[PDB]
Amino acid sequence: PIKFSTEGATSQSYKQFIEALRERLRGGLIHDIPVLPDPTTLQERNRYITVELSNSDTESIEVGIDVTNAYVVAYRAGTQSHFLRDAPSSASDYLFTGTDQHSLPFYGTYGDLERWAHQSRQQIPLGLQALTHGISFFRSGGNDNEEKARTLIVIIQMVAEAARFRYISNRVRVSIQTGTAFQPDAAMISLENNWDNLSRGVQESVQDTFPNQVTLTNIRNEPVIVDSLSHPTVAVLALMLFVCNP
């Protein structure tokens, strides 16, 4: 069971949570980089996991994660659960099966989440207080779809993107250690936007060279061409999407 509590959370407790999540998600290594399982050879009973996000012993939610892409597909508050509009059809057969399950009106893509939130990722604060507020909001069952979408933008980045990217888990750690919320910087956004592209480059690489180049953005909004296994930014990957075997 994978739990994270916001009560007295520390840099270390958050790090240990992300480490446990990464260990459960890893399906193998490719070029020494962890990769998620190939969905075509994965047994469906092994496809979905839960994380408990708690503010106290009496206030908590669960989030359901698809191990094939580390993406949040649903959440649960008590006897009621809510699935992203684009959740795989099998998710509701394995996650929160003892609840009344509902479909959310928005997809889990940032495009649709930002549309419903009326805010972009860059405008939405991340950190312990944002997560605490989101846990409370989901547990309360409030019907405000704008805030549901905003809350998922927070959770997705602090859980799923953090699991995928060492840069992001470390930035959340720093926020917790300092007690200072943050808005995702241009490098964080570009990592989120290019996870599948970086995963593909690594896995398709020949002689360490990507067939399909990947253009990232650094903190100073500078465009960076990543076309090699040895590029420094490749080291930021903690979990890759499965694309192909070498």
Short description:
It is classed as hydrolase. The protein has 246 residues and is of the alpha+beta class. It is built from 8 helices and 10 strands.
Word description of this protein:
It is a single chain. With 246 residues, this protein is an alpha+beta fold. It has two domains: 1-163, Ricin (A subunit), domain 1 (3-Layer(aba) Sandwich); 164-246, Ricin (A Subunit), domain 2, CATH 4.10.470.10. The protein has helices at residues 11-25, 91-94, 110-117, 128-140, 145-164, 166-178, 186-193, 195-204, and strands spanning 2-5, 28-30, 33-35, 48-56, 59-66, 71-77, 80-83, 100-103, 209-217, 223-228. Strand 6 and strand 7 form a beta hairpin. Helix 3 runs antiparallel to helix 5. 39% of the residues are buried. It catalyses: Endohydrolysis of the N-glycosidic bond at one specific adenosine on the 28S rRNA. This is Abrin A-chain.
